[PDB]
Amino acid sequence: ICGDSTECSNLLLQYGSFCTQLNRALTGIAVEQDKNTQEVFAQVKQIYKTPPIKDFGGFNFSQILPDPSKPSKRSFIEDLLFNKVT
Amino acid sequence: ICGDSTECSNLLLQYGSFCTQLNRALTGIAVEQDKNTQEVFAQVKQIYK
């Protein structure tokens, strides 16, 4: 509102406390976003790992399992999804 | 808010783009209503008799 002006700050000071509620709403929004992500993804207690030998009765999961070569440790489909969207 | 008055429109023009947002919101609401009806009712691929 003021952009580093003393007079504007002095005039805004007499409008009561409107800015505290404004900042408190945005803070609640941010905390809610973090809680949403945490409660949608953190569903297990330990980190499991696939065995080095992969013989799943003929089913092929190579397209979805992570690729250690890539630094991101993301799968093929995850890379495609990340590249497709801007 | 002006009722076809030129000077009223000119005076309103210096309040920025409040009305574009208001027009956008109502169109969003209408599209939402059509989507609601379409998804609740259209769930069959064909028409049986």
Next chain:
Amino acid sequence: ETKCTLKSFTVEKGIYQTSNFRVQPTESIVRFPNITNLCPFGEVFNATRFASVYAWNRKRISNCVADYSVLYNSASFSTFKCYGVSPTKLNDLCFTNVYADSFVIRGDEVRQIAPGQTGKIADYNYKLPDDFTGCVIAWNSNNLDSKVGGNYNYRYRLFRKSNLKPFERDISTEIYQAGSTPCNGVQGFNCYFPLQSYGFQPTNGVGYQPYRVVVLSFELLHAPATVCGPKKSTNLVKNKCVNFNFNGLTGTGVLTESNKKFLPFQQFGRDIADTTDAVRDPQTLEILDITPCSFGGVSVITPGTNTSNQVAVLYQGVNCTEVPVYSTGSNVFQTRAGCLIGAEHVNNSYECDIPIGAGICASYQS
């Protein structure tokens, strides 16, 4: 600060936002063009003769340095009043296209020079726009514009079909049809001459003595500046959060050399949303750049007044290069969320107690 913001003498474990940090400007810089020629103002003010009110004299002055202090402090003027700019700030602004209009009116018509004013001179001889910006000066001229033999060279328009548009000149003198029949150049009944003379005499009292009135009109940022006030220009400073006064345009930021490719006719570029980005100094004609001085909120991490009374301070989104009261308190750590002072980085990995961000967080042991 945390106690004051929470309005409580006790604080539970967590992270809180107290205030915001911002860098302060150090010095100031002024850059004005290579112009020092004086501005002729007494020639139009101390002129012997002024034109009539219906044929008011107009002059355009540019490429000069004018001092408004010498005009304001002079008490020889009867009326000194401005509209758009306070007089004390006139010396601090640089304008272009200064117009000076001079004319002579009567004692009671001084009120007619005003926006949205109704009368006779205000609508039949000279019309002032509603959105006029500038200033108006008036003074008495009885000792020089009044003759014992009577002054009749001073005339004013009296008859016209309608009113006059602002800044419109009328010189046509044709017989007026005040009835329903053509006059055909006959001044009889229902036919009056549009011009009415004056009876300026020294024996006449107040309200009829001759008065000389001039006006000054300006513009606001329509072209490169040409006429400024008395000011001194300093040099240029690179990589410093300072406030600048480039050609009357004031701002605050850090100035850096820019590689943008202007064209010989612009003065200052921008990107979007009326955000000035690069400017050109009049003296050197260099493509500069403007970047806002860094800022961001500050946060405090505490394990609770129940346990201890030592805290850690995080500056959000700020490079750990310009931290400074608590700068030399403890170690400095650089995160993706900003800089952190008062805590020690470790190579272990435990559960998260007080989240900080970017995947890292702190806990109490220290």
Next chain:
Amino acid sequence: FQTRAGCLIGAEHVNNSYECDIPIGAGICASYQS
């Protein structure tokens, strides 16, 4: 053409019936073939 939603110009009217891609309203819509 005249429709329950108003008046349409620049579009032809046909007896056929296809899947709806550019909705217009009142149970009718238009598509590019013209």
Next chain:
Amino acid sequence: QCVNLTTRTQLPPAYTNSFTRGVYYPDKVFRSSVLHSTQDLFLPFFSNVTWFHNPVLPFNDGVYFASTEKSNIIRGWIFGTTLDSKTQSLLIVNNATNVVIKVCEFQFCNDPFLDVYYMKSEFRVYSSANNCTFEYVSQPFLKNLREFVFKNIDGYFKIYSKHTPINLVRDLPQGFSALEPLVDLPIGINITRFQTLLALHRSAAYYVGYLQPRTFLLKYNENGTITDAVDCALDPLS
């Protein structure tokens, strides 16, 4: 020093398409990679433009004057109300050296001209000039086409210029190019009509269009040069 010209030269009032020419920079603010919408005076797209193959033409509000002149036969311009000493008049001439801009109560006869002898010095365009207002001199303006835009707003005479080689024979090129601001004259004249000057041999194609107030959308490239424009009211698609 002029006489009535017996040879009543006749130039047919041809009409042709304006296409997409007549765009000039509206201000001096550099922008890059941005789409900016602004409302101002402009020549409407795909309008009807008059081609002359030297009468009196009303000035209206604005004039877009184009000439595919060869060997620089076009000389200058005349502006005024009655083109006589009774009223203030404006004259622009582009002679062999630096140009001349003069504002006086110039007196003109029926057919003013410059003329040349085959050293080259002949100047009898007018007959009298008693009271003058303004004088200005700068660099000369001059197969190759020259486009000029004249605007008289708030006592300011803005002249925007652009010259480009052309290889097409007759019709206007179907392309886009901006018109950078060339000259600003801080003199206010109540113009209503204007003329043209020719370098007659003492021993003819030009295009005229008018401006209207409307809104345009302009695209700026990386270097700040306008490369595309759209008229707001020409087509539902626009």
Next chain:
Amino acid sequence: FNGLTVLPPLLTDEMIAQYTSALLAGTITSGWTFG
């Protein structure tokens, strides 16, 4: 009116009734297999 307008819905009542008829015929004849 004073600047307020009402837009008709895209789906008319007849088409909604036809959808309901199709759903009910499918659930009567074929059981739940048609889903």
Next chain:
Amino acid sequence: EAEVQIDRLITGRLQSLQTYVTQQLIRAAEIRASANLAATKMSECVLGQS
């Protein structure tokens, strides 16, 4: 003075319109939630046994 009077009328009418739009947004969100519930009920209790 017409600018002053028009300004007062404009600010009042604009404020009222904003209030109306906000109420409409809230009501639309509630109706959307109800429609989602109805769609789920149709999907589950009609196309199969629950």
Next chain:
Amino acid sequence: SSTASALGKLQDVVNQNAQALNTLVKQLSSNFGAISSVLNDILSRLDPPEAEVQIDRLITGRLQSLQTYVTQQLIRAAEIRASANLAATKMSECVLGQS
């Protein structure tokens, strides 16, 4: 890999957020009835007694714009939270067990 427009929802959310930010920052360039849109100029040109009126106009306009932005943000966040709850329920019921 080949077909585009398969990720409409996330792109729409991003576009809505960016557009809201853009219009919020663009509203700073409106007179709101005062004589100028930049507060530095009105400070450096005109005396306090009615300059303060001008800043009052600027203040009320900008505060109203900020309030509208905050309310829109709250509505959108509520919608996003509902969608996140649905996603969590689907992930618990269809990934960790046969539904």
